[PDB]
Amino acid sequence: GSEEEIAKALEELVASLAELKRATLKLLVITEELKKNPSESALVSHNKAIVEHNAIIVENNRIIAAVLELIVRAVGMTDEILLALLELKASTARLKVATALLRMITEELKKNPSEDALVEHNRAIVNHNAIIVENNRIIAAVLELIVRALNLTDEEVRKALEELKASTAELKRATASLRAITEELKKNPSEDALVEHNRAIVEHNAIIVENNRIIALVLLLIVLAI
Amino acid sequence: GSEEEIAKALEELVASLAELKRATLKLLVITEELKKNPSESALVSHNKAIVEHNAIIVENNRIIAAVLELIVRAVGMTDEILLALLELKASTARLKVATALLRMITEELKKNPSEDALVEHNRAIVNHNAIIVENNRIIAAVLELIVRALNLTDEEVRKALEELKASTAELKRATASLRAITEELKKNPSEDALVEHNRAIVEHNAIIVENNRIIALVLLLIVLAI
Amino acid sequence: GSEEEIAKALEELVASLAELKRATLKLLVITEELKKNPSESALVSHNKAIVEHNAIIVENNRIIAAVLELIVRAVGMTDEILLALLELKASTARLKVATALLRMITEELKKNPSEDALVEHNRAIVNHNAIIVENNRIIAAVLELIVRALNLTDEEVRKALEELKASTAELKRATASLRAITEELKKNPSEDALVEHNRAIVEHNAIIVENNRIIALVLLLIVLAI
Amino acid sequence: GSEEEIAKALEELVASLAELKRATLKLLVITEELKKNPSESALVSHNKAIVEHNAIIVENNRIIAAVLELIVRAVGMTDEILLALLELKASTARLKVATALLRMITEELKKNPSEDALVEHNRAIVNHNAIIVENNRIIAAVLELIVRALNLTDEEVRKALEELKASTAELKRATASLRAITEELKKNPSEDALVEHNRAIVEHNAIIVENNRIIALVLLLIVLAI
Amino acid sequence: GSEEEIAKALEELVASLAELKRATLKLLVITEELKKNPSESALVSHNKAIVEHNAIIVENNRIIAAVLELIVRAVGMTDEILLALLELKASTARLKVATALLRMITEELKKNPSEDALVEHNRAIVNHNAIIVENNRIIAAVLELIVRALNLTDEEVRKALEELKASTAELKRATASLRAITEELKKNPSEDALVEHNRAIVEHNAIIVENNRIIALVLLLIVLAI
Amino acid sequence: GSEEEIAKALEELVASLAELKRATLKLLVITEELKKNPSESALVSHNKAIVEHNAIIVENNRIIAAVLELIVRAVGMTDEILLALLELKASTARLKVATALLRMITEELKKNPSEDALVEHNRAIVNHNAIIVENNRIIAAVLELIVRALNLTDEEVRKALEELKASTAELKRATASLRAITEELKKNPSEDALVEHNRAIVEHNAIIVENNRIIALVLLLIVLAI
Amino acid sequence: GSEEEIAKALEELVASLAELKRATLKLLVITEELKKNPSESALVSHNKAIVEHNAIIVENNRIIAAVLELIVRAVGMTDEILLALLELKASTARLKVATALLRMITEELKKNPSEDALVEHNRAIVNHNAIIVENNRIIAAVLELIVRALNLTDEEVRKALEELKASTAELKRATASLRAITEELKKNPSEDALVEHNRAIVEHNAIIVENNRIIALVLLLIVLAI
Amino acid sequence: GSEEEIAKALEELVASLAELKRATLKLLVITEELKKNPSESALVSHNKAIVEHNAIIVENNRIIAAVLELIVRAVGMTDEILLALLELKASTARLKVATALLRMITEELKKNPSEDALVEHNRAIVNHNAIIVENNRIIAAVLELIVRALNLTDEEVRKALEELKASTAELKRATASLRAITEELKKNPSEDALVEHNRAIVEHNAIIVENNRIIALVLLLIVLAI
């Protein structure tokens, strides 16, 4: 694309990041309210808020994939870039599918809520997040390839990539930890467990938001360096 | 006011009536869903929807009171009209107060829901409706006085006032019946009772919407007859 | 206004006239179908179609009144013109009011139809049409005044005004005849009468459409003559 | 098809489900309105609304058959899959035929309504629904075959298939019950019966909508598992 | 005042309550952010946010005192009411003074921040809150007197006063607890203590906001009962 | 005075302090601009800005003296307080006189500027400031007496008085230093000296503003302690 | 554009210049306050103020680019003008990108401040300013081309271009000097260095504001000469 | 516009004329004071006062152009009127531009005054005045056309036009004379010359104010004659 398109899309990206931050703060609020005064309708409303937060994350990842497609068409594809973009487009479609899945089981829970339904819903949130994680790893791999293909020497870019790789390994560890406590919850579901679990979900989402911030810094540095 | 103001406000009134009808249909839907699949979060969301329906009714009554003030300033006040308009302005303010009261106990229920809280909330809904009813009785008395002051001979107007008086007596009977079952619920609260009670509330609200339809026919006939 | 505004608004007027003609043809179709195979649901659907046809007429008269306001601001007001435009603006508001009245009793008939409701609805249609007629008489008087104020000597204009005065007297006669058979129906209501009456209504609407055609010829001739 | 096509079509599917839910809520509303104030024109309009709801269901089933064809072309046909898809394509054509039949007898009823015509129309609605049921049984058999062919071990998928088989047996029972009361109505047609019958139709349609929701959950789980 | 003034002022009160709730949620957010990533500039900005939250509480108490003066002029003063209103007006002025004091030492901290300055600022926040508490105790005493003076028998009012007396004793206990940990901090100041202390402050402010909610329920119930 | 008067006057005091701070910032700006690009019209305009800043300080000191008179009438006079208030009233009048003197020689400088006139004007600013200093010493002595007369044990008050005594000794030293460089300028006047001198003046005014801040903290602590 | 558009946009430009001047004065104030009383939260707030000042400069440059596009469309493009406007639009987009980059690392610093973060932030401010400088060089080249293309003989214009070229060479030298002290700071970061560095930044920003003033004089002279 | 708008705008015009007269008297005062006691800061302040006087003249000319647009829309445009109004709107925009130019070089002079800067500023005042003169010639041409288009026979109007044409030729001669002495000053700049020149400027501004008075008499006579 043209420099106007890239710049406009980065304005949309930074707008989406501000919106994502605002939503994360709100979600932390309602997480605290649920912790202090836990109840079944509080659990249902908290889960629905997590679904709307995840939908915002998915739109953020869509905008990032769009920007990357415009950037790569600017610089030119390469074998490893093209293979990573085909992996990215596949993961994007898989995410739209899991997003619809989550929204539909959310509506089932809202209509017919129960503790078993909350457990099933939390497990589906954890799977949705694991798909977001894989989306972020592929986007990070794309940015790694774009920088190595340019041979870009900016120390600010190298520093931001060291941050992005650290955040990625941290995100793998946090994902594994969340799947572990999810397998505990599935074994021993209880309201106290549902609360502790939703807390761990919100921590995982916060780490994903930090990952998306670092990703956006890498995109901004690349678009300035070309 | 001028014919443009009166006509514009009656366009706003008919718009508010269409919105009120739509909301009544929606409330009947969620009432059926609650009857078929009753649950605590369903009860909370149903009650909040009832609160938003009542807020639409209150805005309808505000627009009606505005139109009547423009109509009376068109024709001229009279002793009994002026005393009824002072009663109307008082009842309008009392309704704004009870509206805030209801919204605030609604937020308390949403935050900390329980069966006792549902009983208290249903009793407060029944008191809010009883205030709406008194607002409608005063508005009907105003229209009765306006027609008698004009000495209007239109058989369409006389017919519409016979409908309005029948609707008013019907609304008194329905209000008394709803207060009776509310006193039953307060004695013997149970989920099955909460469901039967919310059903009777929705029937009462439907009767109030019929009252507002008849009131709007009287206003339209008067504005044509002047 | 400017020549572009007047011309655009006359394009909207001729579009509304084509739509009005099309609606009149459709209404004649369903009138014939009702005559051949009369039934209660056919009566209800025919009446609702008459209400939508009347709504098209009302929009036509609104556009005509708009054009006249732009034309008079083009030429300049005069005492008799200003008094006729104040009469026109009043009649426009009265028509919007009666239009809402008709639509609301239409919804009452559709929801709770019966023969008595059909009689009352037909009488209200006849009153709505009588208000359309008064709107057209005032619009014709305005055009008569605009032409006399210009002192316009065009024989095409004089001919079109002789047509407009003949159409106006014809419309008065047809309105009186329709009120007469309406008083018959109200005295002796029957399905066969309801059918014959709806036929006479459709003839009256056809005469109103001829009136609107002549009015549009006068506006076009005036806008060319200025 | 490609992952983009499948994902797009599932977005269209979830859109169709939202539209179907909205239509089901509306249909329940008008069913209540008919129950409270039953009348011949109410019966005709209710039946026409049922026809538009069924047309939405048919479009839903078309989109499901399209998605399944793209999924099977993704995985590859097998003997039992190909035979079930030929059965599905036959049932799809049979449904388009019965849909046109229903729409045409609907137009006959609307044009020439009578109690006998209402009975005949309700019986044709019950036959149309029975064809929808057979379409759903074939779609469920196809999904059962697709999952068994993949050898998919996901416990979420097994649970969703246990839900789909339970919904299918429930839908068989409900279909039999509706044909039984239809044979009663045909024996003893009356307005009170026509109302009770239309109510049972709307309950049957609600069960079909639950079946389509579960079917969509199975498709989403399959598309994620491949 | 008049019913219009009272109703308007209660609309302003409920608006102030919504604003206060929103500010409390925001303050909980930044409290969590400070807990996770504590730092000197984070401490300064958190304290400034607490100062703006307290200023919102003070405006809430001003509006409550205004409403109470209009309510008492509606009912009439009495010896104990007049003495409590003079005590209320004194406490209102003392609060405006302490508000200015707090804002000025806040500006000193912002300009020349250090750990000692944070300790002094936290102690001054705790004194400001203790003054808010005394203002709320006097407002509760006024409402207790107004209800006893009316001799109001409404069980809803008695229930709300049992809530208000419980909230008042709870607020005394929380105030004492906060002064105790404040005396600890002054004895043993450390960044870990500053964080734990600011947490306890935010809990105390949350209890004050609950007190203001109960106070508003009492005012609304009284204004409906007169 | 009453608590309302004292509180209002302290709101006026804090407003005057905010205005004084803003003016001090502006004066530092124009001091930098004069330092960078010194010129005769810049010198004249800088001096006039210093005169308006001093007028703001004088209004601040008038408001402080008013507040102190209301506070002392609240607590009661004493021998040493009454003698200090007579000293304060004398210094207040002497300041109003020197303020008029300064404004008049300011107008002489503006009208007939020259280097000699700038020297004389700067020396008159330094004398005006020395009178402000004496006003502040008397105000501090009054507050010292009021606190000792109450026998007030608040450690916050003792701390603020240790700040006020340190600020007072600092202000004596700074005043002496400014008179010293003023005697240098008078001996060896030059534009470079005029600039360095105006810089030292602005530092002196900043120290006076710090003194007025501490004085206001003492007044606020006293008014809370009574 | 039309002369009305150009004149309006120059009113917007002069408004932006007044706002920029006011912001520059404010920034000099806080630079002095930081110099006198340096602290970590003071450093963070100073940097944030520099970011808001830079955002105002960027909006100024956007308005200048808009005006130039309207001016060139007024006079007509030429080969070198069109190539310079494409260079200008590229630099404009690059500036919007770097502006978002700076704002985001600003939020990182505000959230997680440390001395290393202040150094990194100062280096990013210096890069943002270097991009502003390149934007100004391209805008000056555009104005040089527009004047040479017009062949404008006004000695006032030639004088203003001699000022603009001198300011441009001065701005190159100042940019190089600031990058030099930035490389010193990066080698030997310390709070005393951070203060001296932020001072040099504020001097650089002041020189950019002088450049924007001269640029605006050239635009005004050109728009008068055409 | 309506007669109320025209009358209101003529009240605004006469208010602007009174303000302009008052400002002219003040400017003559400061011209005398500068003549008696000339000095650099006196020169700078005199020039700034001339800039504020010119801004008042520009607002006067804006109001005159507004009134003329309402008057011409009252009478109707004509070919020569429309071409003169397009010339007027162009000259109005050019004047807003030169007004901003003058204010900005005024701020440059105030900030960095010197004899060369005073010469350049006086020459820019003389160019600004020459643009005011062209604005007045176009306004006079418009009024000449409006009167000739009406064919107005009032001898009071003819007399006022003989005054306006004499004033216009006088204003051309005075403008030329002022440009001549401006070219002298530019050749031989000295303080004695700057004083004599500013005197001639103030005489020129007085002649422009006489022109604006005559213009206002023509507008008043026209508005009475229509």
Residue numbers in the entry:
A (entry chain F), B (entry chain P), C (entry chain O), D (entry chain E), E (entry chain Q), F (entry chain R), ...: 1 to 226
Relevant lines from the article:
Here we describe the de novo design of pH-responsive protein filaments built from subunits containing six or nine buried histidine residues that assemble into micrometre-scale, well-ordered fibres at neutral pH. We then applied the filament design method described in Shen et al. to dock these connected monomers into a wide variety of helical filament arrangements and design the amino acid residues at the newly formed interfaces to drive assembly.
The DpHF18 subunit structure and the primary (largest) interface between subunits in the filament are very similar in the cryo-EM structure and computational model. However, the second small hetero interface deviates from the design model, resulting in antiparallel dihedral symmetry (D1) in addition to the helical symmetry generated by the main interface. Even small deviations in the geometry of the designed interfaces from the fibre design model will compound as the fibre propagates and can lead to non-specific aggregation or alterations in fibre geometry, as observed for the DpHF18 design. DpHF18, DpHF19 and DpHF19_9his disassembled at pH 3.5, 3 and 4.2, respectively, and all reformed when the pH was raised from 3 back to 8. Pre-assembled DpHF18–Cy5 fibres were mixed with freshly disassembled DpHF18–Oregon488 monomers at pH 8, and growth of Oregon488-labelled fibres was observed at both tips of the Cy5-labelled seed fibres, indicating that the fibres grow from their ends. To study the dynamics of DpHF18 filament disassembly, we assembled DpHF18–Cy5 fibres and reduced the pH from 8 to 3 in a flow cell while imaging with TIRFM. We observed disassembly in less than 1 s after the pH drop. The fibre lengths dropped very fast at pH 3.1, while remaining stable at pH 3.4, demonstrating a sharp pH transition over 0.3 pH units. The sharpness of the pH dependence probably arises from the very large number of protonatable groups: each subunit contained six (DpHF18 and DpHF19) or nine (DpHF19_9his) buried histidines, and the fibres contained hundreds of subunits.
